[model samples]
Each structure stands twice: as C-alpha cells, then as structure tokens.
Target: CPRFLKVKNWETEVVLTDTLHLKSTLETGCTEYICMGSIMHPSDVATKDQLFPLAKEFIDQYYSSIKRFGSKAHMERLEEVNKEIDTTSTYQLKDTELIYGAKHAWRNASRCVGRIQWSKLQVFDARDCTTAHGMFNYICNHVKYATNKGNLRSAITIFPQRTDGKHDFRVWNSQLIRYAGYKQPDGSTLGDPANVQFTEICIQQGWKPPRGRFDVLPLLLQANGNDPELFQIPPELVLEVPIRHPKFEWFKDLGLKWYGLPAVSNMLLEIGGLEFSACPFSGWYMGTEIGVRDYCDNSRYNILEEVAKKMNLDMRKTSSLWKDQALVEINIAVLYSFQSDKVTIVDHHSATESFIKHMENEYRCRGGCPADWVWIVPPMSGSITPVFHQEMLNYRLTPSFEYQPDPWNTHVWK
Candidate 1:
C-alpha cells in the first residue's frame, strides 16, 4: 500500500515509499509544521494589546465626527466599554460603533489601494445568525448586493461574533466566488491552480464537480462550532463577464470568463479586540489582478506564450519583449471587456492615480495613510502609476482586517 503524507508547510502531499526513512521524515515533518505554522499563524498578542487603544481610538474618532467628542454621554460610553474590556475577556460594540469600526478597518487596510471608497461600504449585520443556513442566506444576499448586476458594489456581510475563546461563525472559502480546479492524471490542472487543494476537499465532502473551467465554488460555512456545511450558490446571483479584446477578433473565442465581484470570505475582521471570522468583504477588481497575475502567471492560466504567438511576436528572442507586450494586451483586454460589459473595473493607471488621491484625502482628513507600496502598485506598468512615485509606510492598526488560516487547516474543521 502507498502511504501519502500531507504537510501544510510544503502545501502538498508526498508519497512515502522508503519505509526505512519514514520515521526520520515524520519527526522532521512535525518539527517543521510546528515552526512554520507558528510563523503563519501568529499569536493573538497584537489583537490582545491593541484592544484598549483601538477602543479609545474608535470612541474618540467616532464621537468627534458626530459632534459628541467631549459630551458626558460619549465619555460615559467610552468609559463603560473600556471598563468592560479591562474586566472581561471579550468586549462588545454597539451597532453604530460596529459599523464605524468596520469602515475604519477598510480605511486602515494597508494592502487595499481602493480605500478611497471605504466610507461607501455597505455593512450587513448578521451577528444574530446562529445557524449555517442563516449564514448562507446572508452570504447570498451579500453576493447579490455586491454583484449588483455587473455594477459591483463594495460590501461586507458580518456574521456572528467571537466570544469566550470561540468563533461563532467561520467561512472556509477564500472567496465567495472562486473557480474550481481539477488535477488531471497528467499533473496539469484544469481550472484555477490556486484552488486545487480546496477543490479536492470540496470533492471529498461530496460536492459534485461540474468539470467546467469557470465553475463558481459553493460556500463552506460553519456556525456555532458545528461541522462546515456546503451551500450551492444560485447561478442567477453571480455576475460573470466573458473575456474579449477590443481589437483582436480571436480573443473572444478564448472562452475565458471571470466573476464580477471578488468577495474575500476567509479573512478575519477585527473590531477592537473581537474577531469576526465569517465576515466577507469585496471591492471591484483592478484589471491587472486578473490579467497579469491570474492569467499570465506560469502556475495559472499561462496564456502569455499563446498570446505572444497569436500576436505574431518572437517568443524565442529575449529583446523582442514578447511577454511584456502580451501582458499589456491582456490587461487592455480585461479593461476593455469589463467596460464593454458595463461591469465595474479599474485599470492600473486609473487605480494608482485614485490611490494617490486617496492618500491626499487621508492625509488631509486623518494625519496620514498607511499603504503597502508593493501591493498598491499595479502588477503591470508599475513605474507609470502615481503610486509608484510615492513612498509608503505600513504598520499594524486595529480595528483591522487580517489574513487567517483556512478553516480546513484549523482544529475547528477537524
């Protein structure tokens, strides 16, 4: 019998053949897993220490904006929340506080270049939902609202709260809509390469694979510590745009398609000290996120070589700049296609300029803006963008949004 060992550090399954080396390998694997997982999943020290600061910061800013800055009522509320935090393990926020906190989280999101629209986020209060089915319903509504029939709207659907060291709700899917990947016998993948392991897990959970290149993944939702449940998203709710080029006639024949809204479902939303693991949020896409990385990356669709050939560019010559040219066309096609379909999408140039405007607004409104230059700059045409010319500083801020381990890897899933 063949033994297969899965390692999270390596992010792949290894076939164990030699029995003599198995013991040593297992020991090494455990140590690596511990070390790597620790780094990947940092302790909640930041979350713990930032509680008081975040509470005070939000209280002062939120109250001040509404002209209640030094009012007795505002002071009493702040003291009450602060005292509660000091005495208890978990602190709660009022509905208004929660709404503003979420908006601030988006504004404080270091990696998001589209924070100019932070105040426009539609926040859904789903903290009352106590069942997986209820979570699914709220998620569906979020998808519909965010999709908005191709005019994508930035929105977040907040699920139940975390308390007593327990997460009341969790979403397993990295995004509300993702393409399914199938690993073929020949080792090539059929869909999104990033989703192969997740696709396998979904299949293992008895999801019937549609065997399509752009099949939208179902929601893997967990509520109140129960086993995660898979809920199929209704096709009508998802808005997808077919890829085509403005000039190239054959580009439309490529049969490529992508969902309108990129609703990230796995990240944790930290408000004060509380974490909402099931809150999913989304913004409209910047073209290069799909064109440059998703389609051109070697591990992904890998259409660069094909596109170069189609464009009659010399693929063998280093100086020909075939890859660069192909990338530009790919990005152009994405922007043109989305615009032609009346779908909301931003080109790299426009997005970076917008980011500059956002920085100006933030500096004028709030002392300074924190941004990750590597992320804020577009994947293609980095130098031309306004964001590339500006220096940026990134630091931890809470309430904030953060990346967390997938539910499958966490003890909750097991």
Candidate 2:
C-alpha cells in the first residue's frame, strides 16, 4: 500500500507517497511548495503592514548612521517602496541600498563571530543576471577576488531577486568550493561525507566524479525556468592549503587539504523584505570549523581514531583522553598548515577573544548584540573560551543571511 502525505506551505502543498518518494520529489523542485522549517515562516512573508515597521527601522537607521540624517531623496524613495508594498508584497532596493544592506546583513549575522570585518565586505551586484552561464562567470570572479593569491578578502555576490511570486535564481553548491563525496559499493565515502547527497545529485546531472578524496565540485547554477548548469572552478583560482603538522611528519602522510576560504553559497540573503536566493558569501575560516567539525565529526572524515592510532595514543580507556589529544593535534596542524601557506585563518582562542571585543563594540554602538552561544563557543575547548562563560541571547533580525531550503528541493530545480 502507498501512504500519501501532503506537506503544506503558505502558498502551496506537496503530496507524496512513501519517504523515498518524498525525498525524490524534494530533490526535483518540490521544496518551494513544502513547508520546511524556517526561523520565521508564513509570518515573515512581509505583508504591507509588516513591511512598514521594517521600512521605518531601515529608514531611521540609514539616515541616522549611514547618511548622517540627510538625503531627502532616500526618504522619498523609501516612501514610494512603502506604497508599492501593498500590491507587490515586497519592494525593490537601489544598487547603493542593496550594497548597504549586504554589509549590514554581515554585521547583523549572529553566528558569525568574525563580524568585526563586516564593513570590509565586497558586494557584487548580479541582480540583472538571468542565465546559468552568467551566474558561472560572476562566481568565477567572486572566487578570484576573494582568493586574491592567499590574501583572502571577505565578499558576497548577489544574484537576481525573488519577484512576481517566483524564485528567479539560485546556487545549488553549499559553498562556492567544496570536495565531492563519492559513495563506494562498500558503503564508504571517498571525500566529504557531508556532501554525499549533493555529490550524487551532481553525478546524476552529468558531473564526472574522480576517484580521490579531495575532488573539488563544480558550481551548480540555475536561472529562471532552465535546467541547472554545472561549471568547473579553475584550480589556480582556488587557494587550497596542504595539511601538515609542525612537529609530526606522519601528519603529512595523511595527505589532507582544505580550501582557504569558506564561501557559503546556498544561504539566502534577505535585505529588508526582498530575498536574494543566489547570494554567495565567504569568510576566512576559524580552524576548529575545519579540524573539529569537518575532519573529526563522526559523519564526516572521522579521522580522529586514525590520527590517534598514528600518534600511538591508547584508545583502550576513555580516561586516557585519546580523542581530546588527537583533536588538539589535528587543530594545531590545521592552524600551522594555513599559516605556513600564507592563508588567513584564526585559532579558536584568538577568534573567541576577537568575538568578545566585537560584542562589546556592538553593544556600545547598537545597544545590544545578539549571539547564538552554541555557535559562538569554539567546537573544541569550549570551557576554555570566554564565550562559554557568558550568557547570550538570540532574536530574529531583518537584513540578515538565513538558511533556506536546498536548491534541489525548490521549484527552481524543475
């Protein structure tokens, strides 16, 4: 017997039979019609009445902080947007306004402890772009500019907006650069375990998967009403650091590597009430995000046991703290490798200290700072970091970057 279920969203409902069918449907662009969880859902859709408050806040803040209480033209334009909100459900932003919003979104990003560099972000406007090839070109430029020969600069390239009750453009790659995961017949993955599903999708979409653990996946791009296009990122354009330990030669034998910048591409960039579903943003990584999560996590590389074995640590007793010792060494190697390669990276301790300073600065300037303590605390040595000692608060804020449903799940994929 086939079981039927209907997943409901604000404007659409998706019906499916078994779990496998649901999964397949989601992969084929039923995502927009289904109500996947969101920080703010149907209520956050920004009705005309809801938009007024956001518009007033943006107007007040823009004039007071950015424009120095000037620019009658800005206020007039905002007023026009406010009036248009009744029929359009969202208002358009001028190029300058969009740039300002992108910077402020970075500043307002709660999980990003590196908000100290918010003002230095380079914003690329590709809102007029309407094809997969055009998106690929913009992404290549984004990679080139952000890489900058190992002197990494934070940047975001924004693509076309969602309008007329439809999604216009979206990037399917979770990051601008990532390793492809190939699941073997023995049920083992060759590369990043976290990317297995996406890797499978890529292979289905005509990507050739190599037999290595560090094959960089190509950019998967989709524009309005077209099949997704895959474009390979040039190797020279991506800055990757070869992992090696400062003290242990055996670490080099593992042959591990990671990209220099963490350029997240799938997260939606919401400014005011409009959403840029295809915005891609990057920041120099904090070491633990790679060493502890990507490498050490059980679902990913699961290298701690292997590393411990190589280091000759006794795994017989939990009291021996083999995992802890191996984790510390791996993190050290990650930090050392990046430093030796002249790539920008932050140690957890230094990153936490900087975050505290960022919070203090935000408090002085904006009354309070919103933080997710779980995310702010370092993955390794949480108790040792100052953020672990402090209580934090979280609340929804607009002009923010938010996690959206994966591109495969959305109607855009169709």
Candidate 3:
C-alpha cells in the first residue's frame, strides 16, 4: 500500500474513489449503500480553472432542457456565472436552477428503484441557515411537510454548500428520524442496531436517551465550522405505524412498530460541481425495506426467527422452509399495517414493475441508464422480481447524491 495519498490536496475526486471502492466490494457479494456517485467533476471544486467548465456544462444542460441552449439568454447567464466565478472563485446557484438540478439528480440515480417519480420531488431551499439553530428549525419544518399526517411526500431540503473548501454544514445522523440503538454490556444492541454508534455520539452530545427500544434519535446539526448541537424532534411530527398481521392477531402482542418517514440525511448532493454537505431527502419506504432488511437482517432487529417460532414452524432445518414462511407473514404485516394505517408505502413487486417501465423510458430518451443490478434487485425473493433477470451497468453521473465521509470521520475541517 502506498498510503491513502491519491488525494493531492482538494483536487482529487476523493468521494468518487470511495464509490468505485464500494462498487468492487459489491462485486464480491458484499453489501453497501445505494447512493454512491461522484461528488463533483474530476477537478478540485475550489479551483475556478476547473469548476468553471463544469459549471458551464450544467448551465448548458439546464438551458437545453428548455430548448434554449446556446440562446442569447443562456449565453448571458453563463457569462454572468463565469465572470462571478472569475472574481469570487465560487458561484451561487439560482433557486430555479437548484430545483431543476435536484430533480435531474434523482433521475440520474443508478441504484434507486423508484426513479419513475424522479421529476416529482418537492425541493425546499434553505441557504439562509447560517446557524445550527436555523438548520434545526428548517429540518423540523421539512419533517412536518414531508410527513403530512402519515401520507408522506417525496421531498429534499438543500442547505448551504461547503465554503472555502472546508467549513461545511453537516447533519450527523444518517437519516432525519431513526431509533436509538444502545450497545449493551454483552455487546448486544437494544434498539435499531445500525444506529448504535450514532446513538452513542448523540448521548455524548448531552442527549438523555430513555433507553427504550424505539426511542427516536435527536438531530445533531453542525452549521458551517461550528461544533454540532443536539436538537430533539417534536414527537408529534413523527408518524409511527403499529404493525398488525392480517390474520395473525397474536402479532399485535409483540408490540412491533416503525416510523412512517424514511428521510435520508448526511449525504452530499452535488449540482454543477457545487457540493451541498447538508441536503436531506425524504420518500416513502418500500415494504421490504422495513420488513426484510430492518426487521430480518441479523445485525438489525433480527425478529424473523422469533416470528417463525410463533408461527409454530419447524425451524430445525432449512428444508422445512420455516424462514421463508415467516418472511411472507412479516412482509404481509408490513404491507397491511401501512395500508390499513393510511400511510404511503409500496410493495417490492409493484415498485420493481414500475422501475421496469422507468427503464424503458430512460433507454428511449437517454440512450443509456446507469444501474447497479445488485442494489436494484430486491433483497429477498431474488428470482421473483423482474429486475433480477435484467442486465444492468453501473456508472457515475453529475447532479447526483453522493456518499461522503461521516461528520466524525471528516477531521480535516474541524
């Protein structure tokens, strides 16, 4: 190993390297995140010599979308942005441009199965947040609008971008709302095990956890270069569903519940080489995302065996098909609970079918669509979904959501 020195200062595509690394890992049958992409063009964002061309390309993209590419209006706007970057070293994005960029970003997402609704995202502009308190308030407002009393809406809130190549605004949690997971003395987790480390960080930041299995985590907002501050989400804004089986009335006694909103935070959103370190996006969950991954994953809640046992299935051998039987019931309850409770959700089958139509349209329009088959295929019932049989290619596109270094891991700025 020659040390992790490929990044020569800020010029290298550091995060995109991580994306390629993750891609190779997935090729080995390893699992990873869905939002993997290049954060910016190959050049360093702070260098106007590099960023200007990228900026100009995206402006051309926007103007061409409205059939105005190379028009007088398009050339004038490009000239204004280039001159602004010439003097200031960085340019600001207009609100309309941000909205357009965000929508296309979703359209260009390779791993997402819900890209059919790409252009339907509601964008919230929050560039005015210069303080952690303001960031917290804006997130709270976003939660309310996206929640919409269990009828969730797809939304993304864009915050101030990185300044001077450092001083980044950050959200410490992976999602806007997640359950606390505490590591017990025996190394077992008490809540959502995926969140144990973040829960510990929140506790260290003066959060008093109730130690309950379903305790909602507080927000840790880092505005600009300031230290993060913990802020609690008002309980009323959190819509939760109590899972009840369609036939197994005994399932209600298990006291299983889940939050309605699936808002992802802590990812970097890049539009025209401008990096947003605090853009959070929210959308409805597919049933299997909660039932299979969250509930059945060994590192997660791991409730499959328990549910299978309750169903009185023979669990001693794989030939009994006990696990498969239990999986059906668990997913059934997830679908039933969400629909009966009037919360927005989609089953994996329906979601995958719609994605096939999306693929057809993208091929007709864009000539090629980037897709990672491993991520696109449903976790359980691999052979059942249509996408499982499809051939796919993986590639990076700009105006995309990117996996970034966690706030704690990014010690260079602080």
Candidate 4:
C-alpha cells in the first residue's frame, strides 16, 4: 500500500506532482548532445602522395643502411634485451598490451638514468604501430602503456611514412639514436646504426616520463608519405610587429600597434610567454595567444612576467630589448611574404580565449553535464575522472611542483 501511498486529496500533492515531473523528465532523457565540428580526412594531398615512395625510401635508405652498418644487429640485441625483460612486472598483459608494457619498462629505466621530466621530451620508434590501419591504435596503445608505467611525458614517436621526413627533418639530429639505443630490423637494438640506413628517424628526443615523449605526436600517412619534419623549419621566435602608420589611430589610441608584433622579441621572451601560457589541455596556441608581448591584456603580460620569473629570466629585458629585435624579424618575414605570392597572417588574438577565462570556462565544462543528451547507457556513462598529482591507473596526472599551490591547486580540482 505504501507504494501507492500518494494521498490523492492531500494539500501536499504539489510536491508529488513536482517529483513526478522530475522523474518523468529524467526517464524521457531531458538531455541534448551538441555536435562538435567535424574533422575531414582529405585524400590526394601531396603528403599522402609521398607516403608509399617515402616508405620504400626509408626501407632502402635507412633500414638498408642500418643493416649495412650493423645497426640492425643492434636492433637484434635490443630485441634480446627486451626479450629478457622481466615480465613479472606487468605479466598479465597480452598481445599489444604485453608488447607495449615491455617497451614502457625499458623506457622508464632509461628515464631514471637520463633524469628528465615528462614536460620536455620526444620519443622515437614504436613497433606496435607498424601494421596497416593500426597507426592510431598503436599510438593509443603505447601512449596508454607508457602512461600506465610512468615512463611517458611529453611526446611519442610514430613512423607515418616508410620514408617521410619533411617538417622536422631539417633540424633532425643524428645523435638522438645514441639515447634510444638503436636496434636492427629484426627488433634487435643497434649499437651505432648508419645515419643513411633508416628511411625515417625521430627528430626530437627527450624524456617525458609517465606517458612517453610529450612532443612527439602519432602520425599517419594514408599511402606512405614524407616525414612531417621536412616541412618544419627552425623555430623562429614569432614576434608581433605593430606596423604603426600614423593614420592607424584606433590602434594607437588603445596603446597598441597593428598587432602584438611590437612586443615579442628573443628566445627568452618567447620562452617566458610560452612557459606562462603553456596549458596542456589547450595545446600550443596558448603560448602565442598569451606569452607574446602585445596589446592583448595586462593579465597576459602578467602571466608572461610570472613565467620569466620562474625561469630566472629578466622580464624587463625580455619585455624591452628582446621583443624589439624579434619584432624586426617579424617585419622582415612580413615584407618577404609580400614580395612572393599571397601571404596570410592568422589573427591568433581573435581566435584564442584569454588566459584568465580559458581555464575558467574549461572548468565549467568539466563540472556541468555536456549539453544534455540521450545516452545509450545513462548511468553507465558520464563518469568524471578526477584530476590528480599522484600515480593512478588509466587516470591522467597533472604534474606539479611542491612550491606552486594556487594555479596547481586549481589544476588538481579539474
């Protein structure tokens, strides 16, 4: 009778009505799902065209050389070492998981000896990603593996092409192999592989513990493509130069130039802003958005100053002299662009959110339900993984030092 104990004639019936409304609404799924912008995977690009030929080139040039120079032997030795790896640690894993677990163990041991952080690093070579249609899964698997083992950090490596090396290859260092302990084609470690042997090589190398190298992102070349590094140029310090023609009164009135160009300058200044604005959640754009000297806001400048202080860089010098020289370079680049074909300078200021508001809004998104939607499994979904500083399985750790509290505390709250 208690189940039907609704007093049909009671004055408190309004409360029951409200409860019923709430229940019915929930049962009917009073949620909406918004679709984020879609990513188009285009075909027939030059990069895609280069994939296969590049892969062959890598096999002929790099791999053949590795074999010729005995690097392949080294790879064999590495395989032996890996084979000897004590699987008692994560022995329960099998298939891809097991292979990745082994790679991660070695990676962690290397980090302990190398003494590097997860923030500054790049990794090279991963066998897990070799098969067709396996690239993303490989990256995901190894990334998850490294993360679980506490060896991952900043970047991971991927061989997108059998031969590509466009973006980063220009500055690719041959010596990075020494750190990785080169291996032969047979999965053996190489002692000193010939530089010419491998079709592709890792350009960036560093330790990114508890994940993998943080800088190296996984890549894919649909057919086989040139390395992304081939297109990468030396990182020129991007400074904004305010092209102040006297007629541009609106900019002058705001104490701003055409853009932030008048502000950004040297490596120190660049790093100052980059360090301050570096948000792992947001990606690299934040560095340009907040760190560069410009007419953005006082808050952006404050963040840059704070970053400089942390790095022991002289903020005054960065804000003044370094930025000035950098602006000159920027002007030159702009001038050079005009001499050629159509030039496009993206307005990063208009695109990126302010530093103060970025985290605030992101935090709001984390706490609130994602624009209500009907779920195939209601209770099964919508679980929030709490951000933490310590090690945990499947959960990501937001790294922090003991000295900083406020900003870092907010990070933990995420």
- Highest-scoring model, TM-score: 3
In model 4, the number of clashes is 72
TM-score of each: 0.86, 0.86, 0.89, 0.20
> Where does candidate 1 stray beyond 4 Å?
1-54, 82-88
Which order, best to worst by lDDT?
Answer: 3, 2, 1, 4
lDDT of 3 at 141: 92
Model 3 TM-score, 2 decimals: 0.89
Q: What is the lDDT of candidate 4?
A: 0.24
- Give me the runs in candidate 3 sitting further than 4 Å from their true place: 1-45, 412-414
Candidate 4's residue-wise lDDT over 28-88, tens digit each? 1112474322212111112433333322322233234234434765455334333333332
lDDT score, residue 264, model 4? 12
Worst ten in a row by lDDT for model 4? 265-274
Candidate number with the higher lDDT (3 or 4): 3
Model 4 RMSD in Å is: 23.7
Pairs of residues at least 3 apart in sequence or in different chains that clash in candidate 3: none
**For model 2, how does the per-residue alpha-carbon lDDT over 158-207 read when each residue is reduced to its tens digit?**
99777753645888899989998888899888999999999898899999
The TM-score obtained by model 4 is 0.20
**Candidate 2 residue runs with Cα over 4 Å from true position:** 1-53, 67-71, 83-90, 412-414
Give the alpha-carbon lDDT of every model: 0.79, 0.79, 0.84, 0.24
